[PDB]
Every structure is written in structure tokens, then in C-alpha cells.
Amino acid sequence: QVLRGTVTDFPGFDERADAETLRKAMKGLGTDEESILTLLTSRSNAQRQEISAAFKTLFGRDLLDDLKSELTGKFEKLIVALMKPSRLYDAYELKHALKGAGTNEKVLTEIIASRTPEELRAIKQVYEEEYGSSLEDDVVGDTSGYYQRMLVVLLQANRDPDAGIDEAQVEQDAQALFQAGELKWGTDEEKFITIFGTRSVSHLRKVFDKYMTISGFQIEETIDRETSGNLEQLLLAVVKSIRSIPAYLAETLYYAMKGAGTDDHTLIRVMVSRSEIDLFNIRKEFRKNFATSLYSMIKGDTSGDYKKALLLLCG
């Protein structure tokens, strides 16, 4: 439960040597995707900006625009995602997800339910400086129903602080979620949105335990994962994130590689955003709840330079 990633700062880092290497890998009608992914995955996101700054000082060109020119396919999407500054990454995926009626609710649910309060505050600020409107206004405008209000509650980042576990508030909270669960989460939705949204993590931990001592079900067992709307998919993600954020994103990666096709966008988004936060913890929860290494599944579900960089980011 000590959070650590798989990509740290490259020791003995030279911004100008790395910038010259990337230019050599691209100048002249030729290819060198190996030299690109070898250097990019081995450098921290902060170092990847220092190289991008030295690349412009040395040659007066935009490193990202040149990489976009020389690469294509899923390998291009992974490289440009590795290039986006970590401070701007989450706000960039949300802005690209709020696309009107074609909004990707999976991206909104994944980021908003799995990010800490201190991370959400930085996203909201960054969103307003890079883009015109605010994140909350863009969410309200492109979503509706109690799924909208559930996101707006979480976007406030005003969850109760972890305090002394009131054993008397636990039984009442667990009894309230039971009645709403027995009505398929369709009766007075405002009541449990406040509980899932504002109660502290340690409290809702013990509330979820008292759920299994009251009913025979776990909280997740009363919500189907496949036949599920936006709200119930958000309850599932908030519950799993309250239990363990590394374990939730681990199951997010697992189902991105099972289906008629591999969700390469979710695969890229989850591994890039968490590469320096908790990817090492995500890998261990993967080996636990799925009886296989994340390295094993990526190798068997991806091809080419796109796969080689993913494996290097994994470990």
C-alpha cells in the first residue's frame, strides 16, 4: 500500500543529448521507432519536457509535431500520450471525452472516481486555464440525470475527512444503502449519492463491511457490471476506488484486453497516467485478482512497436 510507479527519473540525464538522439531518429527519410521508445519510456514525464525544451532550443522545431509526423497508428497515440505533461494529462482526456451526445462516460467515470481530492482540485484549475469554460460546467452541459449530479458531487473534492470511525453512523449508513440496493438503486437516488459522495474513505470502508453483515451480498454484487447504466457504473467505480484505487484501475486494464478488440485508448490512458503514481501497485493487484501478470496479457494482445513500449512501461 506504498504507492510507487514504474517510470522514475533517468539518472545522469542530459536534455541536449537525448534531444539530439530523437532528431537523428527522425531526420532523413527513414525510421527509428526503437530509439524513440527506448528513450521516451526510460525518462520521467518531467525529463520528457526538458528534452522537448532542448529540442526546440537546438533546432527550432516542435518535438511533438515532428513525432506526430513520423509515426502512425497505436504507437503514435502512445507516444503523444507519453509526451503530454502529467499536470495537463487528466484535464486533456476529460476535455476530449466531453464530446456532446458522443460523450465517453467511461473516461469521465474512470478519472473522476479514481482521482484523489487533491488531484481533482488541480484538474479543475488546469482545465479552466487551458480551456475556456470550467470542468463542472462542461460536465453539467454534456451529462444529465443523477449521473450528472453524482459527478458534480465528486468534482467538488469536498469529501469528509477520515476521523474516528463512528460505529453508530456505520450501521445506519450500511442500512440505508441496503434499502436502496434492494430497489435496484432507483429509489430516492439523491439519498445514497450523498453517502457515496461525501462520506470519508475510512468510513465507507467500514460501511461496506457492515453491508456484508446485514445482507448476504457485497455492494458490488447488487449492481451488474455488464447491463448497467451510467449511474450504476459510477457507483461501481466509486466503491472499487474506495476499496483500492490500484485494484480498480487493475481491473480496468484487465477488461480493456478482453473482447472483440483491445481498448487501446483505455490501455494507453491508464498506464500513462499512473506510470509514476501507482503502476507498480496496479501490477500486483493484477497478478492477484486475475492469476496472470499484466506483462503477460499485454504481450498477447498487442503487436509491434506499440507493444514494445507498453512492456517497457510495465516492467
For residue 141, the domain's CATH number is 1.10.220.10
What contacts 132, CB < 8 A, 6 or more positions away? none
Indicate the angle between helix axes 264-273 and 245-256, nearest 10 degrees. Answer: 150
The answer to whether residues 192 and 179 touch, using CB atoms and an 8 Å cutoff, is no
What contacts 115, CB < 8 A, 6 or more positions away? 90, 123
The verdict on residue 4 lying in a domain is no
Show which of 224, 243, 262 is a domain's final residue.
243
| Nearest-5° Cα angle at 275, 285 to 21 | 145
Show which of 120, 137, 156 is a domain's final residue.
156
Whether 22 and 79 share a structural domain: yes
At how many Å resolution was this determined? 2.4
C-alpha cell at 134: 470550467
The verdict on residue 67 lying in a domain is yes
The verdict on residue 279 lying in a domain is yes
Whether 98 and 142 share a structural domain: yes
The verdict on residue 122 lying in a domain is yes
Whether 174 and 237 share a structural domain: yes
Q: How far is CA 93 from the centre of its chain?
A: 9
Whether 134 and 70 share a structural domain: no
The verdict on residue 161 lying in a domain is no
The answer to whether residues 283 and 293 touch, using CB atoms and an 8 Å cutoff, is yes
DSSP 80-106: HHHHS-HHHHHHHHHHHH--GGG--HH
Integer Cα distance of 88 and 127 in angstroms: 8
Integer Cα distance of 41 and 192 in angstroms: 42
Show which of 184, 218, 243 is a domain's final residue.
243
Whether 128 and 195 share a structural domain: no
Whether 184 and 230 share a structural domain: yes
Torsion angle of the four alpha carbons 64, 68, 71, 73, in this order, in degrees rounded to the nearest 10: 120
Number of domains comprising the chain: 4
The verdict on residue 66 lying in a domain is yes
Return the half-sphere exposure (C-beta side, CA atoms, 13 A cut-off) of residue 104.
14
Integer Cα distance of 236 and 254 in angstroms: 16
Whether 68 and 99 share a structural domain: no
The verdict on residue 10 lying in a domain is no
Whether 255 and 286 share a structural domain: yes
What are the percentages of helix, strand and coil residues in the chain, rounded to 5?
70, 0, 30
The verdict on residue 3 lying in a domain is no
* Domain span at 142: 88-156
> Which residues in the chain have their C atom more than 2.5 Å from the N of the next written residue, marking a break after them?
none
Name the region of 165 (left: φ>0; alpha: ψ -120 to 50; beta: rest).
beta
Integer Cα distance of 19 and 56 in angstroms: 9
Whether 92 and 65 share a structural domain: no
Whether 93 and 79 share a structural domain: no
